Ligand binder design. Structure first.
Ligand SMILES: [Zn+2]
Ligand SMILES: [Zn+2]
Length: 370
């Protein structure tokens, strides 16, 4: 979807309606906590809107051209066994970004940081809207500097006509009730989002592609924006319940993957061009290292980088992981010290490590974070 850096545009509309939807569908016997947390979200509407649009303008990433179009099965494929050379981190997908930002949002809300939490939530919804955008050609045709395409700008000038204010039922009915059943947030999200994304892919072939008429486009925008709004409301509903009832999705399950959200200091020369690795050591002495690499320029000054690591051993619990570290290895003979500001590690939907560092890492050395 289209959006603007000031928090306006299609993305912001979706997220704004996501709240109205909840405002009207929330049944009477819903817990006060859910109801009062919704009020806190509404009071931070602007932040929700800024988060909803920010990913298309984020300048603290990898200095690459934005493109938010993936095949709906990408995440599922990357999850299968064998289908990936484990020494390499897994690429970021909209599907995985929903989970990352949702985890960051929950962690922040529980520590009282509502503004930061809302922003992160908005970012999670931005990616859900994307996978719900019916645009799936092999070759993309960008029309602006933010990587948007013509279908999105077409929907943008007509966004107001596509609004909805109800999911179709009350939160005490099937749609909302089914959302709370799966205590495994990450598992639920995967199956929940694919549905919207596949329907979106189908709509692309039958209505939204460039060969279809304007009426087909208007209809495509109508049905996919309704799905996006509804789907978004469902996410926000799940979020409110998760943060209200102190719900933990990682409850006693295996850790097949770890996610690193690294904040590099804004101080001059803090970023590095040297090789960077992440590693872990179990209670039984087994170790595994991964190279943190993405298509763009990694670890830039003041950047916020993301790396997904798939484990060899799929039968380890979070507690079995004793140590965690990052390691630098010289690319050239010239100095290129690295200064990370903060490092968060996520496992099964929960922020298990939140560490401020603000220390220089030089030469070929290892910095332990746990
Ligand atoms: Zn978008
Ligand atoms: Zn986007």
């Amino acid at each position: 979807w289209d959006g603007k850096i000031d928090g306006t545009g299609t993305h912001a509309m979706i997220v704004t309606q996501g709240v109205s939807i909840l405002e009207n569908d929330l049944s009477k016997n819903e817990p006060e906590s859910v109801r009062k947390n919704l009020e806190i979200l509404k009071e931070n509407m602007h932040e929700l809107q800024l988060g909803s649009t920010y990913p298309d303008y984020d300048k603290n990433a990898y200095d690459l051209y934005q493109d938010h179009f993936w095949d709906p099965d990408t995440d599922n494929n990357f999850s299968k066994d064998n289908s990936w050379y484990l020494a390499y981190s897994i690429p970021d997908t909209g599907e995985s970004q929903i989970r990352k930002f949702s985890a960051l949002a929950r962690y922040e809300w529980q520590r009282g940081n509502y503004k930061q939490a809302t922003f992160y939530l908005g970012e999670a919804m931005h990616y859900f809207g994307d996978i719900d955008t019916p645009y799936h050609p092999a070759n993309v045709t960008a029309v602006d500097s933010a990587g948007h395409v013509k279908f999105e700008t077409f929907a943008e000038e007509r966004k107001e006509q596509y609004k909805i204010n109800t999911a179709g039922c009350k939160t005490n009915e099937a749609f909302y009730t089914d959302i709370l059943k799966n205590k495994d947030f990450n598992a639920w999200s995967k199956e929940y989002a694919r549905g919207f994304a596949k329907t979106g892919k189908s709509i692309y072939y039958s209505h939204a592609s460039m060969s279809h008429s304007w009426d087909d486009w208007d209809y495509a925008a109508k049905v996919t924006l309704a799905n996006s709004q509804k789907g978004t409301a469902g996410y926000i509903y799940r979020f409110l319940h998760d943060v209200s009832e102190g719900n933990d999705p990682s409850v006693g399950k295996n850790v097949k993957e770890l996610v690193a959200y690294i904040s590099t200091s804004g101080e001059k020369d803090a970023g590095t061009d040297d090789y960077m690795y992440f590693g872990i050591k179990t209670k039984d002495g087994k170790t595994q290292e991964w190279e943190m690499d993405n298509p763009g320029n990694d670890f830039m000054t003041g950047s916020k980088d993301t790396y997904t690591f798939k484990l060899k051993d799929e039968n380890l619990k979070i507690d079995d992981i004793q140590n965690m570290w990052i390691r630098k290895r010289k690319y050239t003979a010239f100095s290129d010290a690295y200064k990370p500001e903060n490092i968060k590690i996520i496992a099964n939907g929960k922020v298990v490590v939140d560490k401020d560092i603000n220390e220089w890492i030089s030469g070929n050395s290892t910095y332990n974070i746990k």
